[PDB]
Design a protein around this ligand. Sequence first.
Ligand SMILES: O=C1CC[C@H](N2C(=O)c3ccccc3C2=O)C(=O)N1
Ligand SMILES: [Zn+2]
Length: 111
Amino acid sequence: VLAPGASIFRCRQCGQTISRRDWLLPMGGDHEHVVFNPAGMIFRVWCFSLAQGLRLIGAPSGEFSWFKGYDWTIALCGQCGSHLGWHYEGGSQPQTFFGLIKDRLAEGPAD
Ligand SMILES: O=C1CC[C@H](N2C(=O)c3ccccc3C2=O)C(=O)N1
Ligand SMILES: [Zn+2]
């Protein structure tokens, strides 16, 4: 298409470039996974094969992982520090991916 308006995802709080709709990843047959943490917070997580502009904090943990066989690290916006989701590693097909919180991103046109 010409002039697509739903191409890239930016940090909602600051505008840092984070990911792309083309990089959505259907984990378990769906890119969307609705999950809760031990504090009871519900997240609509979109899985992406790739992302940029984040800062991955600390070492991986398997504790409470929403995705079998993966360990996670918190992913902050590398610009403003907003908690955007998690990076998953240590698993299989794929070894790694990102789970980002949908409502913490803004979607819009490319570049
Ligand atoms: O797959 C995941 C990613 C991390 C996530 N997580 C949280 O969001 C959290 C908040 C406070 C204490 C502990 C946790 C934790 O494990 C969680 O529960 N599962
Ligand atoms: Zn940000």
